[PDB]
């Protein structure tokens, strides 16, 4: 019940580059390498949920100004057309999927807090016993560009060949990052949004609060967690009209000691990195 049983690296590559689609996660499966004796959408959206609009044309109205200026008795109501100039305020049909916030951790240590927050600072659920939320709802690992950060319990952490059982270092174990799902899904370390906490009045300011976790609301669309060559299990050809070439999984051509996904001098088959399948694209 792990893809690397049934697929070679070459076949897995062959699969993921050309196609748009096709149990406690214990050890004990058939080993990935045949000589060893032992004892679903696959694409990345090319559009983001909030940019679906036509940038060239106006829309509906939004409330631009609640006062005329600085002074007393300036209350007013003004309005403006939602348009290309301001895209944040336009009305939209669909909204991003559910969220349950994970505490954010940085791989470089000097950034992290000097305290033991492994268990205390983690997302858990209760059933009189408390259990960690892992991996949880499918959410983007980090905001765009910030690879050094990972959700504490929101990602599937594999391990390098020969890794120890306990207290291994960060370089020792692989941490998958769901960068592709950010388009439709909120970042696992960010709040979902804000709500109003009160009713404004002449004496009361508008007050808001953060949404840490948000269930399903009508209109939520989302993507699910990608599958990895090392990942548990339980063809649609690519139809795209895109002009410019795709991002495709590939092996870099540079001199190195060992061939990746091959035996070393001692005969130990090694998998260098996790490989998920989202490479080709689709319009949202």
């Amino acid at each position: 019940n792990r893809f690397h049983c049934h697929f070679s690296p070459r076949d897995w590559q062959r699969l993921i580059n050309n196609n748009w689609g096709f149990g406690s996660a214990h050890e004990g499966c058939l080993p990935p390498f045949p000589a060893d004796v032992f004892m679903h959408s696959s694409y990345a959206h090319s559009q983001s949920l909030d940019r679906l609009m036509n940038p060239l044309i106006d829309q509906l109205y939004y409330l631009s100004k609640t006062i005329n200026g600085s002074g007393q008795n300036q209350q007013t109501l003004k309005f403006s057309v939602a348009g290309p100039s301001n895209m944040a305020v336009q009305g939209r049909n669909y909204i991003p999927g559910p969220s349950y916030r994970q505490q954010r951790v940085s791989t470089t240590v000097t950034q992290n807090n000097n305290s033991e927050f492994a268990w205390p600072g983690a997302s858990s659920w209760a059933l009189g016993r408390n259990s960690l939320m892992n991996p949880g709802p499918a959410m983007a690992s980090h905001k765009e560009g910030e690879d050094r950060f990972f959700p504490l319990s929101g990602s599937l952490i594999f391990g390098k060949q020969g890794t120890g059982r306990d207290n291994v270092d960060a370089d020792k174990v692989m941490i998958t990052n769901e960068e592709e799902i950010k388009t439709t899904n909120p970042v696992a370390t960010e709040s979902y949004g804000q709500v109003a906490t009160n009713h404004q009045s002449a004496q009361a300011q508008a007050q808001t609060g953060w949404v840490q976790n948000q269930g399903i609301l009508p209109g939520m669309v989302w993507q699910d967690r990608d599958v990895y060559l090392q990942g548990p299990i339980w063809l649609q050809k690519e139809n795209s009209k895109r002009w410019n070439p795709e991002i495709q999984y590939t092996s870099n051509y540079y001199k190195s000691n060992n061939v990746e996904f091959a035996v070393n001098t001692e005969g130990v088959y090694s998998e260098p990195r996790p490989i998920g399948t989202r490479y080709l694209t689709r319009n949202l």
Partner: peptide, 11 residues
């Protein structure tokens, strides 16, 4: 080099 699939750890 930085790897795309894993959450990058830097030495």
């Amino acid at each position: 080099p930085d790897e795309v699939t894993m959450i990058v750890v830097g030495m």
